[PDB]
Hints:
Layout: E1 6-8, H1 13-21, H2 31-42, H3 47-59, E2 65-69, H4 96-108, E3 110-114, E4 124-126, E5 144-147, E6 159-166, E7 175-179, H5 180-183, H6 189-195, E8 200-202, E9 215-217, E10 220-221, E11 228-229, H7 241-257, E12 259-261, E13 268-272, E14 276-280, E15 293-300, E16 315-317
Parallel strand pairs: 1-2, 3-16
Antiparallel strand pairs: 2-13, 3-15, 4-15, 5-14, 6-13, 6-15, 7-12, 7-14, 8-9, 10-11
Helix pairs in contact: 1-4, 2-4, 6-7
The protein binds deoxyguanidinoproclavaminic acid.
Deoxyguanidinoproclavaminic acid binds at residues 117, 135-137, 145, 147, 149-150, 205, 207, 232-235.
Domain TauD/TfdA-like: 239-298
Organism: Streptomyces antibioticus
Pfam families: TauD
Amino acid sequence: HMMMTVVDCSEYSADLLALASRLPRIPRQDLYGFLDAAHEAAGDLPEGLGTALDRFNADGSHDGYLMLRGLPVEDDDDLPATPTSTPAPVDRPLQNMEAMLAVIGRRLGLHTGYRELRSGTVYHDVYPSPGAHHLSSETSETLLEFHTEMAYHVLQPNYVMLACSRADHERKAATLVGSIRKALPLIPEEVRARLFDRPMPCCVDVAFRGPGAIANVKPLYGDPRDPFLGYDRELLAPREPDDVEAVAVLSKALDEVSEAVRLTPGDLLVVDNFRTTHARTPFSPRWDGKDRWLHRVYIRTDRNDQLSGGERAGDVVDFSPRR
Length: 323
Ligand SMILES: N=C(N)NCCC[C@@H](C(=O)O)N1CCC1=O
Protein backbone atom coordinates (compact mmCIF):
# COMPACT_ATOMS: atom_id res chain seq x y z
CA HIS A 1 0.00 0.00 0.00
CA MET A 2 1.05 3.59 -0.63
CA MET A 3 2.20 6.08 2.00
CA MET A 4 -1.01 8.08 1.59
CA THR A 5 -3.21 5.04 2.28
CA VAL A 6 -2.43 4.99 6.03
CA VAL A 7 -3.42 8.13 7.97
CA ASP A 8 -2.04 8.41 11.51
CA CYS A 9 -4.75 10.20 13.48
CA SER A 10 -3.13 10.01 16.93
CA GLU A 11 -2.25 13.74 16.97
CA TYR A 12 -5.97 14.52 16.48
CA SER A 13 -7.22 12.59 19.53
CA ALA A 14 -8.27 15.53 21.72
CA ASP A 15 -9.95 17.32 18.82
CA LEU A 16 -11.84 14.18 17.78
CA LEU A 17 -12.99 13.49 21.35
CA ALA A 18 -14.25 17.08 21.57
CA LEU A 19 -16.32 16.53 18.43
CA ALA A 20 -17.69 13.28 19.85
CA SER A 21 -18.59 14.97 23.15
CA ARG A 22 -21.29 17.05 21.43
CA LEU A 23 -22.99 14.11 19.67
CA PRO A 24 -26.19 12.61 21.08
CA ARG A 25 -25.30 9.95 23.62
CA ILE A 26 -28.10 7.52 22.68
CA PRO A 27 -27.87 7.57 18.88
CA ARG A 28 -30.50 4.96 18.04
CA GLN A 29 -33.25 6.95 19.79
CA ASP A 30 -33.01 9.51 16.96
CA LEU A 31 -30.56 8.33 14.31
CA TYR A 32 -31.40 11.08 11.82
CA GLY A 33 -30.73 13.84 14.35
CA PHE A 34 -27.59 12.03 15.50
CA LEU A 35 -26.22 11.92 11.96
CA ASP A 36 -27.13 15.57 11.35
CA ALA A 37 -25.06 16.46 14.42
CA ALA A 38 -22.28 14.27 13.00
CA HIS A 39 -22.46 16.17 9.70
CA GLU A 40 -21.89 19.45 11.54
CA ALA A 41 -18.86 17.86 13.24
CA ALA A 42 -17.58 16.54 9.90
CA GLY A 43 -17.09 20.11 8.68
CA ASP A 44 -14.90 20.75 11.74
CA LEU A 45 -12.56 17.78 11.28
CA PRO A 46 -8.83 18.51 11.50
CA GLU A 47 -7.68 19.93 8.18
CA GLY A 48 -5.27 17.11 7.36
CA LEU A 49 -7.82 14.38 8.06
CA GLY A 50 -10.59 16.16 6.16
CA THR A 51 -8.26 16.56 3.18
CA ALA A 52 -7.25 12.89 3.13
CA LEU A 53 -10.91 11.84 3.23
CA ASP A 54 -11.96 14.29 0.51
CA ARG A 55 -9.12 13.20 -1.78
CA PHE A 56 -9.98 9.51 -1.38
CA ASN A 57 -13.68 10.24 -1.88
CA ALA A 58 -13.07 12.05 -5.18
CA ASP A 59 -11.93 8.97 -7.07
CA GLY A 60 -10.65 6.27 -4.75
CA SER A 61 -7.04 5.17 -4.98
CA HIS A 62 -4.76 2.52 -6.40
CA ASP A 63 -5.12 0.59 -3.12
CA GLY A 64 -8.91 0.93 -2.94
CA TYR A 65 -9.04 1.71 0.76
CA LEU A 66 -8.10 4.33 3.32
CA MET A 67 -6.84 3.19 6.73
CA LEU A 68 -7.16 5.58 9.68
CA ARG A 69 -5.11 4.61 12.74
CA GLY A 70 -4.90 5.87 16.29
CA LEU A 71 -8.44 7.14 16.68
CA PRO A 72 -9.46 7.68 20.35
CA VAL A 73 -10.91 4.27 21.21
CA GLU A 74 -11.80 3.48 24.82
CA ASP A 75 -9.50 1.38 26.94
CA ASP A 76 -10.59 -2.24 26.81
CA ASP A 77 -11.89 -2.25 30.41
CA ASP A 78 -14.06 0.80 29.64
CA LEU A 79 -15.89 -1.02 26.84
CA PRO A 80 -18.87 -3.29 27.54
CA ALA A 81 -18.65 -6.98 26.78
CA THR A 82 -18.54 -7.80 23.09
CA PRO A 83 -22.10 -8.17 21.71
CA THR A 84 -23.54 -11.62 21.09
CA SER A 85 -26.79 -10.63 19.38
CA THR A 86 -28.19 -8.34 16.69
CA PRO A 87 -29.74 -5.85 16.57
CA ALA A 88 -28.09 -3.68 19.19
CA PRO A 89 -30.24 -2.32 22.05
CA VAL A 90 -31.90 0.97 21.10
CA ASP A 91 -30.64 2.60 24.31
CA ARG A 92 -27.00 1.52 24.04
CA PRO A 93 -24.73 4.52 24.75
CA LEU A 94 -22.55 5.83 21.93
CA GLN A 95 -19.04 4.38 21.76
CA ASN A 96 -16.07 6.35 20.53
CA MET A 97 -15.49 4.27 17.38
CA GLU A 98 -19.20 4.62 16.51
CA ALA A 99 -18.80 8.39 16.91
CA MET A 100 -15.88 8.21 14.47
CA LEU A 101 -18.00 6.24 11.97
CA ALA A 102 -20.64 8.97 12.31
CA VAL A 103 -18.36 11.97 11.79
CA ILE A 104 -15.93 10.44 9.28
CA GLY A 105 -18.83 8.74 7.52
CA ARG A 106 -20.75 11.99 7.07
CA ARG A 107 -17.63 13.61 5.64
CA LEU A 108 -17.91 10.98 2.88
CA GLY A 109 -21.66 10.58 2.35
CA LEU A 110 -24.95 9.22 3.65
CA HIS A 111 -25.19 6.31 6.08
CA THR A 112 -27.56 3.70 4.68
CA GLY A 113 -29.37 0.74 6.20
CA TYR A 114 -30.90 -2.19 4.31
CA ARG A 115 -34.34 -3.20 5.52
CA GLU A 116 -33.97 -6.98 5.28
CA LEU A 117 -30.40 -7.02 6.69
CA ARG A 118 -29.69 -6.96 10.45
CA SER A 119 -33.26 -5.85 11.23
CA GLY A 120 -32.83 -2.81 8.99
CA THR A 121 -30.25 -1.18 11.22
CA VAL A 122 -27.60 1.31 10.14
CA TYR A 123 -24.92 0.45 12.72
CA HIS A 124 -23.86 -3.23 12.66
CA ASP A 125 -21.76 -4.93 15.30
CA VAL A 126 -19.36 -7.43 13.69
CA TYR A 127 -18.63 -10.13 16.27
CA PRO A 128 -18.18 -13.91 16.21
CA SER A 129 -20.99 -16.35 16.91
CA PRO A 130 -20.63 -20.09 17.56
CA GLY A 131 -23.08 -21.26 14.91
CA ALA A 132 -22.22 -18.78 12.18
CA HIS A 133 -23.45 -19.51 8.66
CA HIS A 134 -20.52 -19.62 6.25
CA LEU A 135 -21.87 -16.51 4.45
CA SER A 136 -21.96 -14.51 7.70
CA SER A 137 -19.70 -11.78 9.02
CA GLU A 138 -20.15 -13.66 12.33
CA THR A 139 -17.77 -16.33 11.05
CA SER A 140 -14.40 -16.79 12.67
CA GLU A 141 -12.71 -20.16 12.22
CA THR A 142 -13.83 -20.31 8.58
CA LEU A 143 -12.53 -17.78 6.05
CA LEU A 144 -15.07 -15.18 4.96
CA GLU A 145 -14.38 -15.29 1.21
CA PHE A 146 -13.89 -12.27 -1.06
CA HIS A 147 -17.02 -10.23 -1.71
CA THR A 148 -18.02 -6.85 -3.01
CA GLU A 149 -20.65 -5.89 -0.44
CA MET A 150 -24.16 -6.22 -1.92
CA ALA A 151 -22.86 -6.19 -5.51
CA TYR A 152 -26.25 -7.65 -6.53
CA HIS A 153 -28.22 -4.77 -4.95
CA VAL A 154 -29.45 -1.81 -6.99
CA LEU A 155 -28.65 0.43 -4.01
CA GLN A 156 -25.19 -1.09 -3.34
CA PRO A 157 -23.15 1.40 -1.26
CA ASN A 158 -20.00 3.22 -2.36
CA TYR A 159 -18.20 2.49 0.93
CA VAL A 160 -18.05 -0.14 3.63
CA MET A 161 -16.58 1.35 6.82
CA LEU A 162 -15.14 -0.89 9.54
CA ALA A 163 -14.16 0.59 12.92
CA CYS A 164 -12.35 -1.61 15.46
CA SER A 165 -13.21 -1.51 19.17
CA ARG A 166 -11.59 -4.92 19.89
CA ALA A 167 -9.25 -7.01 17.81
CA ASP A 168 -9.29 -10.75 18.29
CA HIS A 169 -7.05 -11.90 21.15
CA GLU A 170 -4.21 -13.20 18.98
CA ARG A 171 -4.49 -10.37 16.41
CA LYS A 172 -4.72 -13.10 13.76
CA ALA A 173 -7.78 -12.02 11.76
CA ALA A 174 -6.79 -10.11 8.62
CA THR A 175 -9.19 -8.02 6.55
CA LEU A 176 -8.14 -8.70 2.96
CA VAL A 177 -8.66 -6.07 0.25
CA GLY A 178 -8.45 -6.85 -3.45
CA SER A 179 -8.23 -3.74 -5.64
CA ILE A 180 -9.25 -3.90 -9.30
CA ARG A 181 -6.76 -1.11 -10.03
CA LYS A 182 -3.97 -3.45 -8.91
CA ALA A 183 -5.48 -6.60 -10.44
CA LEU A 184 -6.35 -5.24 -13.89
CA PRO A 185 -2.76 -5.25 -15.30
CA LEU A 186 -2.61 -9.00 -14.56
CA ILE A 187 -5.77 -9.71 -16.61
CA PRO A 188 -5.35 -10.26 -20.38
CA GLU A 189 -7.09 -7.74 -22.63
CA GLU A 190 -9.19 -10.58 -24.07
CA VAL A 191 -10.44 -11.60 -20.62
CA ARG A 192 -11.06 -7.95 -19.70
CA ALA A 193 -13.22 -7.63 -22.82
CA ARG A 194 -15.31 -10.67 -21.88
CA LEU A 195 -15.84 -9.39 -18.32
CA PHE A 196 -16.56 -5.76 -19.14
CA ASP A 197 -20.26 -4.77 -19.18
CA ARG A 198 -21.35 -8.42 -19.28
CA PRO A 199 -24.20 -9.23 -16.85
CA MET A 200 -23.78 -12.60 -15.16
CA PRO A 201 -26.17 -14.43 -12.84
CA CYS A 202 -25.58 -13.76 -9.17
CA CYS A 203 -27.18 -15.17 -6.03
CA VAL A 204 -27.95 -12.86 -3.10
CA ASP A 205 -27.01 -12.89 0.57
CA VAL A 206 -29.20 -14.87 2.96
CA ALA A 207 -30.87 -11.75 4.40
CA PHE A 208 -32.34 -10.95 0.97
CA ARG A 209 -33.65 -14.40 0.03
CA GLY A 210 -37.05 -14.01 1.71
CA PRO A 211 -34.14 -18.70 -4.72
CA GLY A 212 -31.12 -18.97 -6.98
CA ALA A 213 -29.37 -16.36 -9.11
CA ILE A 214 -32.08 -13.68 -9.11
CA ALA A 215 -29.65 -10.82 -9.83
CA ASN A 216 -27.34 -9.93 -12.72
CA VAL A 217 -23.91 -8.52 -11.85
CA LYS A 218 -21.36 -7.05 -14.26
CA PRO A 219 -17.89 -8.10 -13.00
CA LEU A 220 -16.34 -5.05 -14.66
CA TYR A 221 -18.33 -1.99 -15.70
CA GLY A 222 -18.28 1.78 -16.14
CA ASP A 223 -15.09 3.06 -17.77
CA PRO A 224 -13.22 0.22 -19.56
CA ARG A 225 -9.87 1.95 -18.94
CA ASP A 226 -10.61 2.25 -15.18
CA PRO A 227 -13.51 -0.10 -14.46
CA PHE A 228 -15.66 -0.66 -11.43
CA LEU A 229 -15.62 -4.15 -9.91
CA GLY A 230 -18.48 -6.42 -8.89
CA TYR A 231 -17.13 -9.70 -7.54
CA ASP A 232 -18.45 -12.30 -5.10
CA ARG A 233 -16.55 -15.56 -4.74
CA GLU A 234 -19.58 -17.34 -3.25
CA LEU A 235 -22.58 -15.79 -5.01
CA LEU A 236 -21.45 -14.98 -8.57
CA ALA A 237 -22.79 -17.80 -10.77
CA PRO A 238 -21.68 -17.54 -14.41
CA ARG A 239 -23.20 -20.22 -16.64
CA GLU A 240 -21.44 -19.99 -20.00
CA PRO A 241 -18.01 -21.70 -19.98
CA ASP A 242 -16.30 -18.56 -21.29
CA ASP A 243 -17.87 -16.59 -18.42
CA VAL A 244 -16.74 -19.16 -15.85
CA GLU A 245 -13.22 -18.96 -17.26
CA ALA A 246 -13.13 -15.15 -17.37
CA VAL A 247 -14.28 -14.96 -13.74
CA ALA A 248 -11.63 -17.50 -12.71
CA VAL A 249 -8.94 -15.25 -14.22
CA LEU A 250 -10.37 -12.26 -12.34
CA SER A 251 -10.55 -14.31 -9.13
CA LYS A 252 -6.89 -15.34 -9.32
CA ALA A 253 -5.75 -11.79 -10.14
CA LEU A 254 -7.57 -10.42 -7.09
CA ASP A 255 -5.88 -13.09 -4.97
CA GLU A 256 -2.45 -12.13 -6.32
CA VAL A 257 -2.81 -8.43 -5.46
CA SER A 258 -4.68 -8.93 -2.18
CA GLU A 259 -3.42 -6.90 0.77
CA ALA A 260 -3.88 -7.92 4.41
CA VAL A 261 -5.00 -5.32 6.95
CA ARG A 262 -5.08 -6.39 10.61
CA LEU A 263 -7.48 -4.07 12.44
CA THR A 264 -6.51 -2.98 15.95
CA PRO A 265 -8.48 -0.84 18.44
CA GLY A 266 -8.72 2.69 17.10
CA ASP A 267 -8.39 1.64 13.46
CA LEU A 268 -11.02 2.57 10.89
CA LEU A 269 -10.94 1.11 7.38
CA VAL A 270 -12.80 2.80 4.49
CA VAL A 271 -13.27 0.34 1.62
CA ASP A 272 -14.07 1.61 -1.89
CA ASN A 273 -16.87 -0.89 -2.51
CA PHE A 274 -17.05 -0.06 -6.24
CA ARG A 275 -13.38 -0.91 -6.94
CA THR A 276 -12.50 -3.58 -4.38
CA THR A 277 -13.57 -6.87 -2.88
CA HIS A 278 -12.86 -7.79 0.74
CA ALA A 279 -12.51 -10.85 2.96
CA ARG A 280 -11.67 -11.83 6.54
CA THR A 281 -9.24 -14.61 7.44
CA PRO A 282 -9.72 -17.15 10.25
CA PHE A 283 -9.46 -16.60 13.98
CA SER A 284 -10.53 -18.59 17.04
CA PRO A 285 -13.02 -16.89 19.40
CA ARG A 286 -12.85 -17.43 23.13
CA TRP A 287 -16.36 -16.37 24.26
CA ASP A 288 -14.77 -14.56 27.22
CA GLY A 289 -16.37 -11.11 26.89
CA LYS A 290 -13.46 -9.70 24.85
CA ASP A 291 -13.95 -11.27 21.42
CA ARG A 292 -13.25 -9.25 18.27
CA TRP A 293 -15.67 -6.35 17.85
CA LEU A 294 -15.98 -4.11 14.82
CA HIS A 295 -18.62 -1.55 13.98
CA ARG A 296 -19.80 -1.45 10.36
CA VAL A 297 -21.71 1.16 8.39
CA TYR A 298 -22.46 1.67 4.70
CA ILE A 299 -22.07 5.02 2.91
CA ARG A 300 -23.85 6.15 -0.26
CA THR A 301 -22.57 8.98 -2.45
CA ASP A 302 -24.21 10.89 -5.30
CA ARG A 303 -22.88 8.89 -8.24
CA ASN A 304 -23.37 5.53 -9.99
CA ASP A 305 -27.15 5.94 -9.46
CA GLN A 306 -26.91 5.26 -5.72
CA LEU A 307 -29.16 8.25 -5.03
CA SER A 308 -32.16 9.67 -6.86
CA GLY A 309 -33.09 12.63 -4.65
CA GLY A 310 -34.06 13.59 -1.11
CA GLU A 311 -32.07 10.87 0.65
CA ARG A 312 -30.82 11.47 4.19
CA ALA A 313 -28.13 9.82 6.26
CA GLY A 314 -29.94 7.15 8.24
CA ASP A 315 -32.35 6.03 5.51
CA VAL A 316 -33.18 2.34 5.32
CA VAL A 317 -33.85 1.03 1.81
CA ASP A 318 -35.71 -2.02 0.47
CA PHE A 319 -34.18 -4.82 -1.59
CA SER A 320 -34.13 -4.65 -5.41
CA PRO A 321 -31.86 -6.97 -7.43
CA ARG A 322 -29.64 -5.70 -10.19
CA ARG A 323 -31.02 -6.83 -13.53
N1 LIG B 1 -19.67 -13.74 -0.42
C1 LIG B 1 -20.65 -13.24 0.51
N2 LIG B 1 -21.68 -12.68 0.07
N3 LIG B 1 -20.40 -13.39 1.93
C2 LIG B 1 -21.33 -12.90 2.92
C3 LIG B 1 -21.04 -11.43 3.21
C4 LIG B 1 -21.31 -11.10 4.67
C5 LIG B 1 -22.81 -10.90 4.93
C6 LIG B 1 -23.04 -10.63 6.42
O1 LIG B 1 -22.93 -9.45 6.86
O2 LIG B 1 -23.34 -11.56 7.21
N4 LIG B 1 -23.32 -9.75 4.20
C7 LIG B 1 -22.77 -8.50 3.61
C8 LIG B 1 -24.14 -8.10 3.18
C9 LIG B 1 -24.69 -9.34 3.79
O3 LIG B 1 -25.77 -9.82 3.89
